[PDB]
RNA sequence: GGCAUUGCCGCGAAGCUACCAUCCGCUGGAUUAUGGCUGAACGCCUCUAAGUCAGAAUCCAUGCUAGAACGCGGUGAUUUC
């Protein structure tokens, strides 16, 4: 059809400042400063009142009008995960073995340690991305916390530590072990 | 000592040689399938569309062989008559 004009809105709170070059975003907030790349899109941005951004595509297609909600998508998480932030809750779940995770350093690259999984004798490694943190939650068992402000690396780096803990050669329906993505949300609470 | 078309027999150094002997046979990236992240399309969902992660005896490199006899570089000496 080609859409002569299609627009997303991209709310801007009080604490946050957006600054958009051609498609290099940056956005500034109290928990620090996030950076995306969009150069591969081809929108349009524009302030509209210091409180409002518009993301526009022109002539644009399905596919185009499609990844102009994902653009809007993407900013409103940089804003989220620099006010709010992020935080992925993991659940270690084991029948028999118990599932032994520490963080440990090697050269200074600060490794998610996973050992003993489904009784295995070998060491699974899983590098911290940078800005994401890592905490043992005590007063629940077997929790995991991974905070950070861009939740792509939080993700990531939970997916990571799920993939890690794939169960090979056996019925997986049976051999529940792993470490599971439990909760999504955000660092500061009720916001 | 000769000859027996190496006369025959035992041992036999050297050389050649045998999984019949011994030694040696490298580690990085990118990927496929696949499993994932974020995420619209489609208020939800979604590994996919934009973007992205891991990943095969695969691929391309590292390494190994040859060195273009019309590919190239550095360097030495260049004829007293
Ligand atoms: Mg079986
Ligand atoms: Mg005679
Ligand atoms: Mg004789
Ligand atoms: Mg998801
Ligand atoms: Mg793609
Ligand atoms: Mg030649």
């Not at 004009?5 to 400063?33: A, D, W, Y």
């Not at 690259?109 to 996973?114: G, L, P, Q, S, T």
């Not at 939970?158 to 329906?173: E, S, Y």
């Amino acid at each position: 059809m080609k859409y002569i004009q299609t627009e997303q809105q991209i709310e801007v709170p009080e604490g946050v400042t957006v600054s958009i070059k051609s498609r290099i975003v940056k956005v500034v907030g109290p928990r620090g400063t996030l950076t995306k790349n969009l150069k591969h899109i081809d929108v349009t941005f524009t302030k509209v009142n210091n409180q409002l951004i518009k993301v526009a595509v022109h002539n644009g297609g399905r596919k185009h009008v499609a990844a102009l909600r994902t653009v809007k998508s993407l900013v409103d998480n940089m804003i989220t995960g620099v006010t709010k932030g992020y935080k992925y809750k993991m659940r270690y779940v084991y029948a028999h073995f118990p599932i032994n995770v520490n963080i440990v350093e090697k050269d200074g690259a600060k490794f998610i340690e996973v050992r003993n999984f489904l009784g295995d004798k070998k060491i699974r490694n899983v590098p911290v991305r940078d800005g994401v943190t890592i905490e043992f939650s005590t007063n629940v068992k077997d929790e995991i916390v991974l905070s950070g402000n861009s939740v792509e690396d939080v993700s990531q780096n939970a997916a990571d530590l799920q993939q890690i803990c794939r169960v090979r050669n056996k019925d997986i329906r049976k051999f529940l072990d792993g470490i599971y993505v439990s909760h999504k949300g955000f660092i500061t609470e009720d916001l």
